[PDB]
Amino acid sequence: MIREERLLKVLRAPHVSEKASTAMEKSNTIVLKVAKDATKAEIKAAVQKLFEVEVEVVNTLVVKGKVKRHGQRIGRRSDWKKAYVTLKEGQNLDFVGGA
């Protein structure tokens, strides 16, 4: 494929947030703590080879940490990158381990 890129680890970690399970109509989607820079296309493909599910579309964004914490008074942000990404209907979680 044109797997030549970083399809290796563009995706990682779920989210099990409040949005989880609440965000499931015609198509369960997802979250994934996707790497800060995985783009949409790479994400679409990430779930292709792995998870073996059919992705319709991707979205993603950023969300930023922020907090003071220090030996006295400093502390800083953290940064992330959410990613909904939709799948389909005719294919459920199937043989897998939810969590």
Contact partner, 33, from RNA, other proteins, Mg ion, none, Cβ < 5-8 Å per class: none
Sign of CA dihedral 20, 18, 69, 78: positive
Give the end-to-end CA distance of the chain in Å, rounded to a whole number: 31
Site string for other proteins, 43-62 (x = CB under 8 A): --------------------
Find the binding residues for Mg ion in span 4-33 (CB under 5 A). Answer: 19, 22-23
Q: Which two tokens stand for residue 45?
A: 């493909």
19/76 with CB nearer Mg ion: 19
